[PDB]
C-alpha cells in the first residue's frame, strides 16, 4: 500500500479580514487600501506651486505695495497662508468669493497697461494708509482721480477690444465719510460711476457715512470687475468717486486653483497635494483630507480597510481537511506521499499559478486608476452665510457618504470571492487526483488517498504529472481491496 | 440492511423574495427592511421640541406682541405650524431664508440689552397696526426713532465688542408712503442708514411710494442683520428712517434646526422625527418622508424590501433531493433512519449552528447602524424662485435615486448569498456522511444511503456522532453488496 | 460495453467579456449595454417640440417684432438655436437665467390684456431701433410712457386678482443717456418706479450715463417681474421712467423645459431627446450627452459595456466529454448527451437543463435596475460666460453624479458576468452528477466527463438512461462480472 495526501500552505501569523458572510476570517496575507498619513510637506514637482506668504491673491492682484513681488506671476496651485494681512487703503469686494475663484482658476496675473485719458482731473491720488516707502501711495493697478483746480468735469472715455482674447478690467468706487469730504474731493454733491459694454452695464452710487478707523481712515473703497469679449467696447462714464483702471488682465482657461494651507514647501515629487501636505497615490482611498488637488485617491470616512491576498489560514500524514501545512514553503498547494522509501513532499505549480493570476490585479477590474480633479468648490468656511453655504456643505456630505458605502461594500465582496476561489481550487485539485485513481485507491475521508498496490517514487511522480495508468496496477489492486 | 437519509426542515407557509438569479423564490422566513408608517405624533424625548403655535421663528425673534411668550427660549428642534400669522407692522426681509436658517441653527433667542444713546430724537414710536393691549405699540426688540421738536440731527453712535463671543444685531429701515410723510417724520427729504464694522459695511437708502394697505398701513419696514466678532466695533450713522436695535442676540454653534409640521406633540421617546411624526429606527430604510431630524433610516423610493433569513422552502423515507421534511421541528438539518427496530429521526446541531451564525448579523457587515443628521437644506417650497431652487431640487433627487439603487442591489446580493450558503451546508453534510461510510454503503440517488450490514440504533448513533468504524462491519458488507 | 458522454455546445466566433475574477473570458454570446450614437434628428412625437428658429424665449415673451409669430404658443420642449438674435430696443434682465427657467417650466405664453388707466401721460412710445414695418415701434407687451404737454404727474394704479390662479406681470425701467434726455422725456430730474403687493415690494431708481451704441441708441431698459396670488392686489406707483405692463401672463405647473440645439426636426417617434438628436431607450446606459429630456438611459463615461448571454466558449480539440472540450457539432441545445455503441455513435440534447439556464439568464438586468426614469426640467449643464460660485457648484454636482453612476454601471456588469459564468458551470456539473447517480455501480467514470458502461446498453438503454427510467438491478449482476 501507499499514502497520497493533498494539502495547502499556512503561515504562523495571519491577518483578520471581513467578508459578506463572516465578520472575521483569518488569511495568510492582506493589503491596506486606505492612506491615512502625510509627511507634512508640499512637493514642488511636478505642479508649479506658488507660495503667497503674507499676501492674499486679491491683494496681489490689486497691487498692495508689500505684495509688489507678485506682479505678472503664474501658477498651477496658489497657496494662501493664515498669516496674510492687508496694508493699504481699506476696501471691500461684493461677491469676494466669485472674484477670488475666477482669478485662481485663470492662473495668471499678467497685466497690460493702456493709455486712458482723463481730461480735467488730478491723477495718482494717495493715502497715508498705503505707504510706498516714506511717501503716501495707493494700489499699483488703480488710479485715484480727484478734482483739478475747482472743477470735476463729466468723464466719458472708451476703449475697444481689437484683440482675439478676453479682457478683464478691475475698477472701484470711493465712499467718503462726510458730505464735506465729498464736496472737497469731488465737486458734485453726489457722484456716480457707470461702466458698460454692448451687452452689459453697471452703475454705482457712492455711500456716505462714518466708519471705524482702519489705518487712520474712515472712508472705504468698493471693487468691481468687467469682462470685454473680442470685438466689443468698454465705456466709462462718471461724474465723481471713480477709481479708474490702468489697464487690463489677461484671463485664461486652464487647470489652476487655490488652496489654504500652512504646510512648508520642499523639493520632492508628488502628484497629490492636500492642506496637510503631499500624499502618495498608490492606494485607491485616503482619509487625510477631503480637499485635494491633482491625481488623488478618493476620500472616505474609514481609517482602515484590509483586502485579502491569500487563502484562509488554518493551523496544522493528513490532508487539507481542517489542517494546514506549516512546513510547506515551495508553493500554495501540494502533494505529500508516504511510502516504503519514506515520506516525501512536492508542490503543484498549475493550481498555484491559477490562484495567483486570479488574485493579482483584482481591484483594477472595477475601480479606475486615478481621477484627476483640479478646481472645485470650497469645503471649509470662516463666516456664517446661510443658504449657499448650507447647500455646499450638503453636497459634500452626500458625496462622502456614498463613496464610503461603495468602498465598504467593494472590500467585503472582493474578500468573499477570493476565499471562495481558493477553496474551489483546492477542491478541484483533490477531485482531479481522485479521477486519476479510478479503482486502485480509496478516500480516507481526511483529504488523503490510500493506494492498494505498490506505488514507489516513480509511481507518485507519474500520478503527480498526470501520466498515471491504472490498468498496469489494476488487477493487483483489485486483489488488495476485496 | 438499513436506510439512512439526510434532510432539511420545511414550513407550511413561506415568503417570496428576489435574488440576482431568480425573480421569485420561496424561503422559510424573511424580514422587512423598509419602515413605511408613523404613529402621527412627535415625541418630546430625548430632543427638546419647541412648538411655535401661532408664531414663526422670525416673528418671535423680532418681538411680535402675540409672540411675547417666546422671549429667551431654547430648542433642539423648532416646529412651525401652518396656522401661524403676523400681527404687527408690515415688513419684509431681503434673504429671509438665510436669516431664518442661521437663527434656527443657532438654537437660542437669548437677548442682551445695551445702553444706546440717541441724542436729539424721540424714541419708542408705535403704530395702530401693532397693538399691545389698548395702546399703539411696536416690535419689542426694535426702537423706532422720529424727529424731536423740529429737527432730526445726524446720528453717530459706536459700540465695541469686549466679550469673547460673537454678537448678532438686528436693525431696520422704514419706507414711507409719500414725500410729505417722509418730511413729517424725518426732517430731511432723503434719509440714509449706514452700519459698519472694521471688516464690513452696509448702506440703505429708503424707498418712497404707495403700497396696498396691511392692517391700515401703506408704509413698510426692511430688516437687516450684522455680526460683530470679538475685538471689533459697530458704528451706526444715520440721517433718517432708522429702526434702531435695543441690544444683541447671542449666536452659538450646535445641532439645532427647524421643521414645518402639523403633527401634535406627545409624551414618548423616539430618536427620529419627520413631518409625519416620530418613527422607529430599527430598520435601515424608510419611505415616510425625505425630511428628517435625528438618528434616522435612509430614505428610499421602495415601499417594501424583503431580506431572507432562512433556506428555500420545498414541499414534502426520502432525502433532501427535491423534498423537505415538514415533520422536523427540532432543527434545520437532520438525519432519519429506517431499521429493524423502526423509523427514527434526529437533528444535526453543528450545521444548523453554522448556518444560523452565518445568517445572523449579515446586514451590519456592510451598512452602518445609524447616521445622525441635524441641520440640512430645505426640500419643499411654497413659491417659485428659479436657479437656486432648481439646484436644491436636483441635488435631493440625485441623492434619492442613488440610495434607492444601492438598497435594491444590496438586498438582491444578500439573498443570493444566503440561498447559496444554505445549499452548500446541506451538501457538505451529505458529503461528510458519504465519507464516513467507506465501502459499506451505497448512494440511492435520492439523498439516502443504503447500508448493507446490520446497523442498529447504536450503529446509527455512532454514524451520527462521527465515531463510526467501517472495518468492524467491512467484510460482511462486502458479502452483502457483491 | 458502451460509452456515454456529456457535453455542451460551442460557437466558432465568441466574444470577450470581463468578470470580477478574470480580466478576459470568451463566451458564446453577449449584448451591448451602452448607446453611443444618434441619427442626428429630433422626432416630433410624442412630445410637442417648438422650434424657436431665430428667436430666444425671452424675446418671444417680450414681443420682439420679428418674433410676433410666437404669440400665445405652447410647448413640451422649447428648442433654442444658436443663430437667434435680438432686433429691438437694447435691454438687460437682472437674473436672466431665473426668468428664462421660470418661463420655460411654465410651458405657455398665453397673455391676457388688462385695461390700465394712465392719466396725464402719453402712451405707445417707440424707437427706430425696433421697427414694425416702416414706422418706429416697441415691444408688443410693454407700454412706454412719456410726458404729456409739459407735465408728468405721479401715477398710482391698482389691479386686484379676483381669479383663482396666479398672475405674472412683466415690467421695466428706462435708463437714459444724459440728464438733459431725462428731463426731456420725464419732467422730474430723478425718476422712480415702485411695484408692490401685500407680501412683497420692489423699488427701482434709474441710472444715467452714456453707453455704447446698439442699433443707434445709448439708453437701456431693465426688465423685472412680479407674481400676484389669488386674492392679492398689485399697486404701481411711479413718477418717471416706467415701462408699463399691458396685461398678465398665465403661469402653470407642468413638465415643460427648454434646450439648446442645432439638430433638425423630423417626423418620427422617439421618447428620448438630446442636443445631438433623438436616441432609442432600449439600453440602460448612454454615452451621447448628459443633457436629456424624456424617458432616457442613464449617462455614463464608458463607451462600451458587454454583458454575457451564453456560457464560456471552449474549442473542440474516441468521443469526449465536457472537460476542457466543447461540441461544435451541436446545434439542438446547450447541454446534451452522446453515446458510442455497437449500432454506432448517436447524439441528443437535454431540454430541462437548457431551459433552466436560459430562464435564469433571461431578464437578469431587470431585477436590479429600473426600466426608464423620466426627467423633464433640470439644471443647466453648459455655460457660455464665467460667473463664479453658483456655476462652480452646478459643475461640481453634475461631475459627482456622473462619476457615481459610471462606477455603478462598471461594478454591476462585472458582478452579473461572474454569476452567469458560475450558473452555467454549475448546471453542467449538476447534469453530470445526476447521470452518475443513475448509474449506481454499473459504470465507471473515465475522468474526461465520460462514463463507460460494462454491460450491453443499446439505443433503448441509452434512451432509458436519458429519460431517467434506467433500472440498474436488471443489468446489475452482468456488470458485476465485467468490472471485476
Ligand atoms: C462718529 O463716530 C466715530 C466712531 O466713534 C468717530 O470715529 C472716531 O474718531 C476719533 C477722532 O478722529 C478717533 O480718535 C483717534 O483714534 C486714533 C487711534 O486710537 C487708537 O490708538 C491709540 C494709540 O495708539 C489708543 O490710545 C486708542 O485707544 C485707540 O486704540 C488716535 O491715534 C487718534 O489720536 C489723535 O488724537 C489724539 C488726541 O489726544 C492726539 O494726541 C494724537 O496725536 C492724534 O492726533 C485719535 O484719538 C477714533 O479712533 C474714531 N473711532 C473709531 C471707532 O474709529 C467719529 O469721529 C464720529 N464722527 C463725528 C463727526 O463725531
Ligand atoms: C395709491 O393707490 C392705492 C390703491 O388704490 C390707494 O390706496 C387706497 O387708499 C384708500 C384710502 O386710504 C383705502 O381705503 C380705505 O380702505 C379701508 C379698508 O377697506 C377694506 O375694508 C372695508 C371694511 O372692512 C371694506 O368695505 C373694503 O371693501 C375693504 O375690504 C377702509 O376701512 C377705509 O375706510 C375709511 O373710509 C371710509 C369711507 O367711507 C370711512 O367710512 C371709514 O370710517 C374709514 O375712515 C378706507 O376706505 C384703500 O384701502 C387703499 N387701497 C388699497 C388697495 O390698499 C391710494 O389712495 C393711492 N394713493 C393716492 C395718493 O391716491
Ligand atoms: C461718450 O462716449 C461715447 C463712446 O465713444 C460716445 O458715443 C459715440 O457717439 C458718436 C456720436 O453719436 C457715435 O458716432 C456715430 O456712430 C454711428 C455708427 O458708426 C458705425 O458705423 C459707421 C458706418 O456704418 C462706421 O463708419 C463706424 O466706424 C461705426 O462702425 C454712425 O453711423 C454715426 O454717423 C453719423 O455721423 C456721420 C458723420 O459723418 C454722418 O455722416 C451720419 O449720417 C450720421 O449722422 C455717428 O458717427 C459713436 O458710434 C458712439 N460710440 C459708441 C462706441 O457707441 C458719446 O457720444 C460720448 N458722449 C459725449 C457727450 O461726448
Ligand atoms: C486723494 C486724496 O484726497 N487723498 C487724501 C485722503 C482722502 O482725502 C480721504 O482718505 C478720503 O476719505 O485722506 C488722507 O487724509 C486726511 C487726513 O490727513 C486729515 O487729517 O483728515 C482727513 C479726514 O477728515 C483725511 O483722513 C489720507 O488718506 O492719508 C490725505 C490724502 O491726501
Ligand atoms: C412713529 C410714528 O410716526 N407713528 C405713526 C405712524 C407712522 O407715521 C406711519 O406708519 C408711517 O408710514 O402712523 C400711524 O398712522 C397714521 C394715521 O393715524 C393717519 O390717519 O394717516 C397716516 C398716513 O397718512 C398714518 O397711517 C400708525 O401707524 O398707527 C400713527 C402713528 O402715530
Ligand atoms: C418714446 C421716445 O421718447 N422715443 C424717442 C427715443 C428716446 O427719446 C430715446 O431712445 C431715449 O434714450 O429716441 C429716438 O431717438 C433719438 C434720435 O432721433 C435723436 O437724434 O437723438 C436722441 C438722443 O439724443 C435719440 O436717440 C429713437 O430711439 O428712435 C427717437 C424716439 O422718438
Ligand atoms: C489634516 O488636517 C485636517 C485639518 O482640517 C485635520 O482635521 C482636523 O483635525 C482636528 C484634530 O482631530 C480636529 O479638531 C478638526 O475638527 C479637524 N478638521 C476637520 C475639518 O475635520 C486632519 O486630522 C489632518 N489629518 C492628518 C492625517 O494629519
Ligand atoms: C407623509 O407626509 C407627506 C407630506 O408631504 C406625504 O406625502 C404627500 O402625500 C400626498 C398624498 O398621497 C401627495 O398628494 C403629496 O404629493 C405628497 N407630498 C410629497 C412631498 O410627496 C406622505 O404620503 C406621508 N407619508 C405617510 C406614511 O403618511
Ligand atoms: C454630442 O454633442 C456633444 C456636444 O457637446 C459632443 O461633445 C463634444 O464633442 C466635441 C468633439 O469631440 C468636443 O470637442 C467637445 O468638447 C464636446 N463637448 C462636450 C460638452 O463634451 C458629443 O461628442 C456628441 N456625441 C455624439 C455621439 O455625436
Ligand atoms: C502579500 O501580498 C503582496 C501583494 O499585494 C505582496 O507584495 C507580499 O509580498 C505578500 N506577502 C507575503 C508574505 O507573501
Ligand atoms: C424569522 O427570523 C427572525 C429574525 O430575523 C426571528 O425573530 C423570527 O422568529 C423568525 N421566524 C420564525 C418563524 O422562526
Ligand atoms: C444572443 O442573445 C440575444 C439576446 O440577449 C439574442 O437575441 C441572440 O439571438 C443571441 N445570439 C445567438 C447567436 O443566439
Author numbering:
A (entry chain C), B (entry chain A): 12 to 327, 337 to 502
C (entry chain B): 12 to 328, 336 to 502
Provide excerpts from the study.
Next, we solved the apo structure of the HN/4-10 H3N8 HA by X-ray, and the complex structures with avian or human receptor analogs [LS-tetrasaccharide a (LSTa) and LS-tetrasaccharide c (LSTc)] by cryo-electron microscopy (cryo-EM). Comparative analysis of the overall structures between the G228 and S228 variants of HN/4-10 H3N8 HA revealed a remarkable similarity. In the structures of H3N8 G228 and S228 HAs complexed with the avian receptor analog, the receptor adopted a trans conformation and established robust and extensive interactions with RBS residues. Notably, glycine is present in AA 228 of all other H3N8 strains. Nevertheless, the HN/4-10 H3N8 strain studied here remains predominantly an avian influenza virus and has not yet fully adapted to humans, as it retains Q at position 226 in its HA.
The discovery of a degenerative codon at position 228 in the human H3N8 A/Henan/4-10/2022 HA protein sequence, which may encode an amino acid residue G or S, suggests dynamic viral adaptation for human infection. We find that the human-infecting H3N8 HA has a dual receptor-binding property with a preference for binding to avian receptor, and the G228S substitution slightly increased binding to human receptor. We then solve the structures of the H3N8 HA protein in complex with the human receptor or the avian receptor, and identified the structural basis of H3N8 infection in humans.
